[PDB]
């Protein structure tokens, strides 16, 4: 099938309400002092506790 009518900019932007990405999900490393992903090793000094 082919579209019957042109899609307006109002309808197009409504459809993109939920099209987006999320936050990485990061925590602070208490050896590096810098940010890292949860349950992943630090990348500054390469340490993983626990």
Partner 1 sequence: GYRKLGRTSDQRKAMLRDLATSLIISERIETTEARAKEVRSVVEKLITLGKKGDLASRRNAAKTLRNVEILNEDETTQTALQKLFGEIAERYTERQGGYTRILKQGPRRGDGAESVIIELV
Partner 2 sequence: MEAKAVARTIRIAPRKVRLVLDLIRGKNAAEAIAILKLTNKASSPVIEKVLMSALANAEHNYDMNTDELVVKEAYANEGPTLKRFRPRAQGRASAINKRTSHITIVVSDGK
Q: Which residues of this chain interact with partner 1, rule CB under 8 A?
A: 37, 39-41, 48
The CA distance from 45 to 34, in Å, is 10
CA angle 26, 16, 10 (to 5 degrees): 145
Identify which of residues 5 and 39 has a Cβ nearer to partner 2 in the complex: 39
Q: Binding residue for partner 2 (CB under 8 A) from 4, 21, 30, 46?
A: 21
**Site residues for RNA, window 8-47 (CB under 7 A)?**
9, 12, 15-16, 19
Q: Is 4 in the site for RNA (CB under 7 A)?
A: no
């Amino acid at each position: 099938a082919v579209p019957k009518r042109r899609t307006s900019k109002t309808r197009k932007n409504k459809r993109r309400t939920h099209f987006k990405i999320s936050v990485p999900g990061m925590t602070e490393c208490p050896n590096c002092g810098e940010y890292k992903l949860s349950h992943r090793v630090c990348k500054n000094c390469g340490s993983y506790n626990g």
